[PDB]
Design an enzyme around this catalytic site. Structure first.
Site, PDB file in Angstrom:
ATOM      1  N   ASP A 161      -8.193  -2.758  -6.716  1.00 28.92           N
ATOM      2  CA  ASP A 161      -7.669  -2.544  -5.371  1.00 28.92           C
ATOM      3  C   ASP A 161      -8.681  -1.780  -4.528  1.00 28.92           C
ATOM      4  O   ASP A 161      -9.199  -0.733  -4.950  1.00 28.92           O
ATOM      5  CB  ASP A 161      -6.332  -1.767  -5.414  1.00 28.92           C
TER       6      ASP A 161
ATOM      7  N   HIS B 231      -7.605  -5.884  -0.653  1.00 28.67           N
ATOM      8  CA  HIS B 231      -6.626  -4.941  -0.124  1.00 28.67           C
ATOM      9  C   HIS B 231      -5.352  -5.707   0.213  1.00 28.67           C
ATOM     10  O   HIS B 231      -5.420  -6.663   0.984  1.00 28.67           O
ATOM     11  CB  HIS B 231      -7.181  -4.214   1.116  1.00 28.67           C
TER      12      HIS B 231
ATOM     13  N   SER C 170       0.872  -1.187   0.000  1.00 35.33           N
ATOM     14  CA  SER C 170       0.000   0.000   0.000  1.00 35.33           C
ATOM     15  C   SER C 170       0.900   1.225   0.000  1.00 35.33           C
ATOM     16  O   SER C 170       1.750   1.336  -0.899  1.00 35.33           O
ATOM     17  CB  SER C 170      -0.998  -0.058   1.158  1.00 35.33           C
TER      18      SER C 170
HETATM   19  C1  LIG Z   1       0.117   6.856  -2.346  1.00 36.85           C
HETATM   20  C2  LIG Z   1      -1.030   6.103  -1.760  1.00 36.85           C
HETATM   21  C3  LIG Z   1      -1.090   5.277  -0.653  1.00 36.85           C
HETATM   22  C4  LIG Z   1      -2.431   4.789  -0.544  1.00 36.85           C
HETATM   23  C5  LIG Z   1      -2.909   3.837   0.491  1.00 36.85           C
HETATM   24  O1  LIG Z   1      -4.044   3.380   0.486  1.00 36.85           O
HETATM   25  O2  LIG Z   1      -2.020   3.483   1.383  1.00 36.85           O
HETATM   26  C6  LIG Z   1      -3.164   5.346  -1.587  1.00 36.85           C
HETATM   27  C7  LIG Z   1      -4.603   5.201  -1.959  1.00 36.85           C
HETATM   28  N1  LIG Z   1      -2.294   6.133  -2.320  1.00 36.85           N
HETATM   29  C8  LIG Z   1      -2.658   6.865  -3.528  1.00 36.85           C
HETATM   30  C9  LIG Z   1      -3.116   8.258  -3.225  1.00 36.85           C
HETATM   31  C10 LIG Z   1      -3.775   8.996  -4.312  1.00 36.85           C
HETATM   32  C11 LIG Z   1      -4.580   8.522  -3.162  1.00 36.85           C
END
Ligand SMILES: Cc1cc(C(=O)O)c(C)n1CC1CC1
Ligand SMILES: *[C@@H]1O[C@H](CO)[C@@H](O)[C@H](O)[C@H]1NC(C)=O
Length: 360
Positions: free
Chosen positions: A254, A303, A146
């Site tokens: 995801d 997830h 993640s």
């Molecule tokens: C860099 C990142 C970590 C996570 C996470 O769920 O840990 C998510 C969704 N991102 C993308 C961000 C645009 C929203």
């Protein structure tokens, strides 16, 4: 409970609240492989959202309550039954306590309530590991899930260059990015970016990099140039600029991607519009992986994967993730291997059209 906590000896490398960052270690002295795993857990991009995360997600912001030991699970397991890939390796779990997608290099000061030092944490862990055996390693696999998976993409080449500049050209640095390959797409229904959940993928990182003083890989930085470094948090844009070998693991559907897209698949009907949106999302994800030669991308709604105990169960085209990673190892000893594939991307277009998807 096999990995032992070590708080960083350089106490200027801190979690958000200024407490020492650190790492959990299980040494395997008959092995020259080192696995450094970057925890995930979203992020916070302003004082308000970080103050709330400190109130009810404090372990992600502070080492003051960390346990003295951790059990290695999944790819961090030492049991061959649970970890057919790298069960004999030296295992390192790096807790995520910087809330910055592992991109920050900012000391907490009179001006800043919180320190965002994720990138400096990785470098300092690597530096203190050198004296504990890493100096003799043959392979350092930087892995993460993640936000830790995005962290791998942001940091793998820095680790490579750090080790070169320090005088260890022999250590092969590689990356394994799990569930950190995101699309900066349009939301299914628009929500105002107020928090981490209701914030569009693009707006979240734009505020983020500014708040953390986040740093991104150099070549990617030089493509998008000033003001536009947020682009380098999205894998399909930063991956082509990376020098180190990087294996990408990514569910086509995801759950965190669907969350930031404002999609909630309950068990109730999904109407034509949502069906189209979800199918297009899987297609775009596939497209971005077409030129990633080492990748594992099952058509599942889930997830994360690689530190869960039953990570061995999923297959794409008849191959498990531990087998694909072994084949990737062999490919790095170009021209494909007989019966040992490394590019494994489902093509069917709906969650759970792969029968081996995790079931809940
Ligand atoms: C860099 C990142 C970590 C996570 C996470 O769920 O840990 C998510 C969704 N991102 C993308 C961000 C645009 C929203
Ligand atoms: C300790 O960490 C701080 C924070 O980045 C850094 O400025 C300093 O150079 C480090 N000291 C050593 C000896 O590595």
């Amino acid at each position: 409970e096999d990995l032992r906590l070590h708080l960083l000896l350089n106490t200027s490398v801190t979690c958000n609240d200024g407490s020492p960052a650190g790492y959990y270690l299980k040494e395997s002295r008959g092995s020259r492989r080192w696995l450094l795993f970057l925890e995930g857990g979203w992020y916070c991009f302003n004082r308000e959202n970080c103050d709330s995360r400190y109130d009810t997600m404090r372990r992600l912001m502070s080492s003051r309550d960390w346990p003295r030991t951790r059990t290695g699970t999944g790819i961090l397991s030492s049991q061959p039954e649970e970890n057919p890939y790298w069960w004999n390796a030296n295992m390192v779990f790096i807790p995520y306590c910087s809330s910055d997608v592992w991109s920050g290099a900012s000391s907490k000061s009179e001006k800043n309530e919180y320190a965002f030092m994720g990138a400096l944490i990785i470098q300092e862990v690597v530096r203190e590991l050198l004296g504990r055996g890493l100096s003799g390693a043959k392979v350092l696999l930087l892995a993460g899930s993640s936000a830790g998976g995005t962290g791998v993409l942001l940091n793998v080449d820095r680790v490579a260059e750090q080790l070169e500049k320090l005088g260890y050209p022999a250590i092969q640095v590689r990356g394994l990015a799990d569930s950190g390959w995101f699309l900066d797409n349009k939301q299914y229904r628009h929500t105002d970016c107020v928090d981490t959940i209701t914030c569009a993928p693009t707006e979240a990182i734009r505020r983020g990099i500014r708040y953390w003083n986040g740093v991104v890989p150099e070549r990617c930085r030089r493509q998008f140039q000033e003001g536009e470094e947020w682009n380098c948090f999205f894998g399909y844009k930063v991956y082509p600029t990376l020098r180190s070998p990087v294996f990408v693991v990514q569910w086509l559907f995801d759950e965190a991607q669907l969350t930031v897209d404002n999609v909630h698949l309950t068990g109730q009907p999904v109407q034509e519009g949502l069906r189209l949106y979800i199918q297009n999302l899987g297609r775009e994800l596939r497209h971005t992986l077409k030129d990633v030669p080492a990748s594992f991308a099952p058509a599942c709604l889930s997830h994360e994967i690689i530190i869960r105990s039953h990570w061995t169960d999923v297959q794409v085209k008849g191959t498990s993730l531990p087998r694909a990673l072994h084949c990737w190892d062999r490919s790095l000893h170009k021209t494909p291997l007989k019966g040992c594939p490394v590019h494994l991307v489902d093509s069917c277009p709906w969650p759970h059209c792969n029968p081996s998807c995790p079931t809940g």
